[PDB]
Amino acid sequence: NFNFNGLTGTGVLTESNKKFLPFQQFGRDIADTTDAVRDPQTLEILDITPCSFGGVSVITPGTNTSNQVAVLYQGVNCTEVPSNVFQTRAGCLIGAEYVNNSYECDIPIGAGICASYQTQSIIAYTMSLGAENSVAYSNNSIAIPTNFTISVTTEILPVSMTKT
Amino acid sequence: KMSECVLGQSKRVDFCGKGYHLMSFPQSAPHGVVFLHVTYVPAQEKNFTTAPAICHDGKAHFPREGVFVSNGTHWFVTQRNFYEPQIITTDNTFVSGNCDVVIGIVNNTVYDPLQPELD
Amino acid sequence: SVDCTMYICGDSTECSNLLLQYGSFCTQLKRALTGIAVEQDKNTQEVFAQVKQIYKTPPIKYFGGFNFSQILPDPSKPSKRSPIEDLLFNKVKFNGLTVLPPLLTDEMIAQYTSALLAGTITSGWTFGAGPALQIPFPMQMAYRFNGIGVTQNVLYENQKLIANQFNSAIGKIQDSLSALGKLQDVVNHNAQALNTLVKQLSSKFGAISSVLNDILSRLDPPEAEVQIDRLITGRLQSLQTYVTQQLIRAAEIRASANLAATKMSECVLGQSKRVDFCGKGYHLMSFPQSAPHGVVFLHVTYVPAQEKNF
Amino acid sequence: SVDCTMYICGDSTECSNLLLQYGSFCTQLKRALTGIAVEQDKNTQEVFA
Amino acid sequence: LSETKCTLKSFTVEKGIYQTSNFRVQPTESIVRFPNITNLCPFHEVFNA
Ligand SMILES: *[C@@H]1O[C@H](CO)[C@@H](O[C@@H]2O[C@H](CO)[C@@H](O)[C@H](O)[C@H]2NC(C)=O)[C@H](O)[C@H]1NC(C)=O
Ligand SMILES: *[C@@H]1O[C@H](CO)[C@@H](O[C@@H]2O[C@H](CO)[C@@H](O)[C@H](O)[C@H]2NC(C)=O)[C@H](O)[C@H]1NC(C)=O
Ligand SMILES: *[C@@H]1O[C@H](CO)[C@@H](O[C@@H]2O[C@H](CO)[C@@H](O)[C@H](O)[C@H]2NC(C)=O)[C@H](O)[C@H]1NC(C)=O
Ligand SMILES: *[C@@H]1O[C@H](CO)[C@@H](O[C@@H]2O[C@H](CO)[C@@H](O)[C@H](O)[C@H]2NC(C)=O)[C@H](O)[C@H]1NC(C)=O
Ligand SMILES: *[C@@H]1O[C@H](CO)[C@@H](O[C@@H]2O[C@H](CO)[C@@H](O)[C@H](O)[C@H]2NC(C)=O)[C@H](O)[C@H]1NC(C)=O
Ligand SMILES: *[C@@H]1O[C@H](CO)[C@@H](O[C@@H]2O[C@H](CO)[C@@H](O)[C@H](O)[C@H]2NC(C)=O)[C@H](O)[C@H]1NC(C)=O
Ligand SMILES: *[C@@H]1O[C@H](CO)[C@@H](O[C@@H]2O[C@H](CO)[C@@H](O)[C@H](O)[C@H]2NC(C)=O)[C@H](O)[C@H]1NC(C)=O
Ligand SMILES: *[C@@H]1O[C@H](CO)[C@@H](O[C@@H]2O[C@H](CO)[C@@H](O)[C@H](O)[C@H]2NC(C)=O)[C@H](O)[C@H]1NC(C)=O
Ligand SMILES: *[C@@H]1O[C@H](CO)[C@@H](O)[C@H](O)[C@H]1NC(C)=O
Ligand SMILES: *[C@@H]1O[C@H](CO)[C@@H](O)[C@H](O)[C@H]1NC(C)=O
Ligand SMILES: *[C@@H]1O[C@H](CO)[C@@H](O)[C@H](O)[C@H]1NC(C)=O
Ligand SMILES: *[C@@H]1O[C@H](CO)[C@@H](O)[C@H](O)[C@H]1NC(C)=O
């Protein structure tokens, strides 16, 4: 919590590498927020970055399966959170182990990272896209079906809501 | 969807189910509607070898509504979605041109039904 | 996502107890914004994840001629995008405000689009109705000429000319590219609507000042609560305006992603007879490419030329 | 279109300077109303031309 | 798990992923920066003449 001869603010202070003109005190961003200052006594430029905030999410396999839980701190660097600590493009995940396998998605974490209660507890590791089919294409080959199946599926659509 | 899947047969892909639309049935729900889509799905495929045309007597023959296929040694015509091979005759093929402009022509005999029967 | 309490009050504690008196106004706004964010991932799942398997093109890569090299993936890249998808991607913390990342990376989106492309080039329209059944590309092109009412020897006797015309038309697209204003407009309107919400924090709405410390710092509680309630009223009105417009703007993006899903089904996974749904002319086939926050469809059509009278 | 300032104040400077304490409400309102006047010409260009 | 049950207002949560709260680092101490000092009143001549 800082006060630079009038400028009151909060944040992390860091050594800069910008160069003010020798009469300018602080710098502003587009959308007009203070993002640099000059220290009056030593006259050096320091950047002002905001601290760290973010949502907290809880990943559960369902209380009818287990009571273990994993926790996602969203877009927080996993070194400033307060076992399994795992860093994701979506935040820091605690309480799930990261495996190297891959096949489908169960609980979506983000940025191609999913979790499941398998190997159980909570885990993190994308969710893949789908199987892998390899068509034997050639310049004189064809495949023709010899049988069929009759299939029937459903589709549900809302038409109305309640008149109040 | 009630107009195009229940009172008709749709050709639009993936509009009345997944597969080839045969028919649809409506059912009422609390504040909406359920469609039951009946579609055809092909199954159990085999590979064969194909050609675009058949050369015979210096002419190029194309199938009227099918594909030319080969089981390894013989040449037939099927319809494209269900395997049902037929002898290539002048009743299920048509002619246009000579057989040196198409690429992939194969040599095979096209059977004339009148020629023997008459004689 | 906006934290209602941190945008309004913001650190101060005299403001949180006063805002607690308004009920569930801030819970509603967070629900409204969270619904919008969950809808944006379903938009993308509905447009792009329209394929069971991840199909691959064969190594030889020779479609009896036709040349698809500018739209197939580039193996010498971390992103594995195509040449035209690389052209398209070079043309397009605060007071409680946060940006969440999409569930699908755009590597994943490029991987869905290349599989849709290899399904089409190798199996025609059979992979959209069941298992992929290979067919040679010239014969698939001849099936499609039948679908527009042309007899199929017109293709086989003109194969080289038809392949050259396709190749030149594909070459002209990069030059016409190296347009995307419909994708820039969405980004611009959203950034500009987010800039106004932040600028609305330096307004006094009829209080002495617009900074929650100086207001109190120069007065008692009985006298400051009056000004802080005016500040609260203005800042809550601004946030409601913002959220209502995001709700109206997301329903417009959803109607567009719904049109894209229908086009991907009907112009890429099949051949359409609907007039002008897949370009001008008689629809032959269509190819998808991923753009930032969007999709590009390259429609191949047949246009008649050089008529005589009889 | 509606001029937001002339609707609220209507040729009065005492009211206009007090209206400046709310920020960009009238700019927002005019921008919203103009964007739906531009959409109407696009609507009939897309049907008839 | 209990914070999730409270967020949903239920005693049975079905499988999924739920946003439950937020993590905000905490700041300690308040550093007040400022400038040096100007001339000091010449009190030494009025008192020491
Ligand atoms: C404000 O005063 C401090 C000292 O009270 C000055 O700090 C001096 O900075 C010079 C650098 O040119 C050093 O060589 C001195 O040793 C520093 N003095 C002390 C006591 O640390 C500071 O420079 C002054 N502010 C300005 C703008 O000159
Ligand atoms: C086509 O597929 C059907 C299955 O859908 C085959 O019929 C099945 O045959 C097995 C073995 O004879 C029986 O156990 C099943 O009861 C049959 N299913 C039904 C629904 O009757 C049929 O034989 C296949 N046809 C060909 C030519 O392969
Ligand atoms: C069609 O023929 C191809 C060519 O052999 C078959 O595809 C190969 O199948 C084997 C065994 O499943 C694989 O190991 C190869 O990788 C496949 N691809 C090749 C050789 O390019 C395919 O199974 C045949 N299809 C049917 C329906 O019988
Ligand atoms: C391709 O199909 C033909 C069917 O016309 C097969 O040839 C016949 O096979 C039957 C039974 O083996 C014999 O009774 C006939 O004499 C054969 N010839 C004719 C003209 O009918 C042929 O064997 C099949 N080839 C393969 C590789 O399966
Ligand atoms: C298909 O049949 C034609 C006619 O029977 C073949 O043409 C002959 O090919 C031989 C060998 O190349 C030549 O010596 C003859 O002069 C050709 N005759 C004519 C009229 O062109 C043709 O080669 C056959 N195709 C294949 C692949 O065997
Ligand atoms: C497919 O088309 C591309 C053009 O977009 C071909 O690549 C170019 O080929 C010309 C000569 O034909 C070269 O001068 C260019 O440098 C090539 N551009 C590249 C490699 O980026 C490509 O060869 C065509 N494919 C085939 C199989 O011919
Ligand atoms: C087919 O014939 C018609 C004429 O019957 C051509 O239209 C003529 O074009 C000339 C020059 O533009 C006009 O001066 C005539 O008035 C037109 N005729 C009529 C009846 O209006 C038409 O261009 C011809 N098209 C082709 C492909 O030959
Ligand atoms: C008032 O004036 C007297 C004399 O001018 C100051 O006395 C000086 O004190 C310092 C420190 O004790 C000595 O180093 C000097 O030698 C003294 N001066 C003489 C002439 O002896 C006294 O300091 C002054 N008062 C103040 C408050 O500064
Ligand atoms: C939920 O519990 C019931 C009974 O305890 C059990 O039959 C059912 O399989 C459970 N569901 C899951 C998903 O485990
Ligand atoms: C977290 O901070 C450390 C220390 O600077 C840094 O090495 C790491 O890269 C940061 N996290 C991310 C995701 O960059
Ligand atoms: C996953 O595979 C990589 C291969 O580069 C390896 O380095 C890593 O140790 C593996 N992870 C685990 C948990 O075994
Ligand atoms: C198919 O490719 C083979 C190469 O294995 C070549 O010999 C043949 O001429 C080609 N035929 C057609 C019809 O493209």
Author numbering:
A (entry chain A): 540 to 621, 640 to 676, 690 to 734
B (entry chain A): 1028 to 1146
C (entry chain B): 735 to 826, 854 to 939, 944 to 1075
D (entry chain C): 735 to 783
E (entry chain A): 296 to 344
Original authors' sentences:
We then employed single-particle cryo-electron microscopy (cryo-EM) to determine the structures of trimeric S proteins in complex with ACE2-PD. The structures of ACE2-PD in complex with S proteins from BA.2.75, BF.7, and XBB.1 were resolved at overall resolutions of 3.5, 3.9, and 3.9 Å, respectively. In these structures, the RBDs of the S protein are all in the “up” conformation and each one binds to one ACE2 molecule. The monomeric human ACE2-PD exhibited binding to the RBDs of BA.2, BA.5, BA.2.75, BF.7, and XBB.1 with binding affinity (KD) of 4.80 ± 0.01, 3.2 ± 0.03, 1.2 ± 0.01, 4.1 ± 0.02, and 16.2 ± 0.03 nM, respectively.
The Omicron sub-lineages harbor multiple mutations in the S protein compared to the original strain (referred to as the WT strain), which mediates receptor recognition and facilitates membrane fusion with the host cells. Binding of the receptor-binding domain (RBD) to the peptidase domain (PD) of ACE2 triggers conformational changes in the trimeric S protein, leading to exposure of the fusion peptide and facilitating membrane fusion with host cells.
